[PDB]
Design a protein around this ligand. Structure first.
Ligand SMILES: COC1=CC(/C=C/C(=O)OP(=O)(O)OC[C@H]2O[C@@H](n3cnc4c(N)ncnc43)[C@H](O)[C@@H]2O)=CCC1=O
Length: 526
């Protein structure tokens, strides 16, 4: 096995600590400081307020019948209540499964069932999605805003007394978070993330003498990324709490709101995804705003090419900018070392250096051999931060994490001479044209370079005599009349022949997950 490790040294990680105990370990150093800020209504909770409310929610959840290893479902947009419920369940040795509140009724009930959730925490507007299932199956509904009939109100939880939390012995391998993901192979799976696992991931990012991601108690981190997904939950909320930073909560990305809040609150840490990066590059109004407070700009969760990366870099010239790479199954696998307290130099388009306290290898899919530097293969990772497994699915677990503890990602990439990882694309997303592999993300990146294209996606199309050809879905810049042949030519002049785009279909919007991924499967259906 050829093994890769971080340019940083391994550190001591106290992963015997419950998640809440770890995140609030240093709370007395910053108990008075801002912890959570509600962007919508201006409200501020201090660190003390947040530990207090979480303790109370714990006592209230117990009084509602939550025991250790029981499951609650959080069905909420980003909010203080998401956080209180999440940590609240943690105090009980219980589990939060979190879900996109914009799921259809059928998706909600499916997750509620597969997780065995005993309580759903949500908004009044989403009650109709779950009411009938919940009432027929002894599942309580708690709403944060108003309580429809048959429902309870969140304040029922915060009424409970802070020192009424039952005695509990939480084990390191006890589950605390159950996000669902379709990422690797198949239908939605319950990803069992443990106290030990999450404490490990957080530490890998923000602890140590030279942390991989330097953040401190005077920082203000923007929380626009969805907390129901691992990137925000882990890198924004849990990392933010650990270091005592202020966390500014936005319920929905809007380019105007986004810029105003960065300016108004003097945001210093900007955790973004490629769709937000792109809006920043393509938006004419970014110049009208003082964004000089931002010192760290991050992108993760989907492919981002070096050119778009370079473009936005110039719009935050006194900020360190770069990418991290992660999975529901693992939290971040690699993280940009330009974010380090004593920074390292980086290249644009890289997705970071493998985190410390971990091992990475690159495996040839054809042979199963580990590869040297500068060669493409399947990324594998081994460390205490990876999931315990898929909920009720040992066989999918055994298929994804081998007996030596290697997690096979399904992502193709290579590590270079400077220990920086580059992702090419998901193994299965590669287009086979004749006998060449074409990576959709390479061509999406060139498309986004065009001044008259605001958004794009590339997927294979069935071709009678080719098998598959690359096609593009494109969103024209406001006003632009750019044609299919102009887009095809624009691409054709830059690439070797097998990478050519065969058709361009023009649309109003590219379908994207809230985590910032192109919904490639919806386009294939179209
Ligand atoms: C700042 O970096 C961080 C990112 C993440 C991402 C989790 C996630 O992404 O969701 P999931 O549905 O499981 O799908 C995971 C899949 O998304 C793709 N992906 C991810 N990041 C990249 C990237 N930088 N470049 C190219 N592709 C990428 C990749 O295929 C991975 O398996 C968490 C924490 C973190 O700190």
């Amino acid at each position: 096995d050829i093994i890769f490790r971080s340019k940083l040294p391994d550190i001591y990680i106290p992963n015997h600590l419950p998640l809440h105990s770890y995140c609030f370990e240093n709370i007395s150093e910053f108990s008075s400081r801002p912890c959570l800020i509600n962007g919508a209504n201006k409200q501020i909770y201090t660190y003390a307020d947040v530990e207090l409310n979480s303790r109370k929610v714990a006592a209230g959840l117990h009084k509602q019948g939550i025991q250790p290893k029981d499951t609650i479902m959080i069905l909420l947009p980003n909010s203080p209540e998401f956080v209180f419920a999440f940590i609240g369940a943690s105090y009980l040795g219980a589990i939060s499964t979190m879900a996109n509140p914009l799921f259809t009724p059928a998706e909600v009930v499916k997750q509620a069932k597969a997780s065995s959730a005993k309580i759903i925490v949500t908004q009044a507007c989403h009650v109709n999605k779950v009411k009938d299932y919940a009432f027929e199956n002894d599942v309580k509904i708690i709403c944060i805003d108003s309580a429809p009939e048959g429902c309870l109100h969140f304040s029922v939880l915060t009424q409970a007394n802070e020192h009424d939390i039952p005695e509990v012995e939480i084990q390191p391998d006890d589950v605390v978070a159950l996000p669902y993901s379709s990422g690797t192979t198949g239908l939605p799976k319950g990803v069992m993330l443990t106290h030990k696992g999450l404490v490990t991931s957080v530490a890998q990012q923000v602890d140590g003498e030279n942390p991989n991601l330097y953040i401190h108690s005077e920082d203000v981190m923007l929380c626009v990324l969805p907390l129901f997904h691992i990137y925000s939950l882990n890198s924004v909320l849990l990392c933010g709490l650990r270091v005592g930073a202020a966390i500014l909560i936005m319920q929905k990305f809007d380019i105007v709101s986004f810029l105003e809040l960065i300016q108004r609150y003097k945001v210093t840490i900007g955790p973004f995804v490629p769709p937000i990066v792109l809006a920043i590059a393509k938006s004419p109004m970014v110049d009208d705003y003082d964004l000089s407070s931002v010192r760290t700009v991050m992108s993760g969760a989907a492919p981002l090419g070096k050119e778009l990366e370079d473009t936005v870099r110039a719009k935050f010239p006194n900020a360190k900018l770069g990418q991290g790479y992660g999975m529901t199954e693992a939290g971040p696998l690699a993280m940009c070392l330009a974010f380090a307290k004593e920074p390292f130099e980086i290249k644009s388009g890289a997705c970071g250096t493998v985190v410390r306290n971990a091992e990475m290898k690159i495996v040839d899919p054809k042979t199963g051999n580990s590869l040297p530097r500068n060669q493409s293969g399947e990324i594998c990772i081994r460390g205490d931060q990876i999931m315990k497994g898929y909920l009720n699915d040992p066989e999918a677990t055994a298929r994804t994490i081998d007996k030596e503890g290697w997690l096979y990602t399904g992502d193709i990439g290579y590590i270079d001479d400077d220990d920086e990882l580059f992702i090419v694309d998901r193994l299965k997303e590669l287009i086979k044209y004749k006998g060449f592999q074409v990576a959709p993300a390479e061509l999406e990146a060139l498309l986004l370079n065009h001044p008259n294209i605001s958004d794009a996606a590339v997927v294979p199309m069935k071709d009678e005599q080719a098998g598959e050809v690359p096609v593009a879905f494109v969103v024209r810049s406001n006003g632009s009349t750019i044609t299919e042949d102009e887009v095809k030519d624009f691409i054709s002049k830059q690439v070797i022949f097998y990478k050519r785009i065969k058709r361009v279909f023009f649309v109003d919007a590219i379908p994207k997950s809230p985590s910032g991924k192109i919904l490639r499967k919806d386009l294939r259906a179209k």
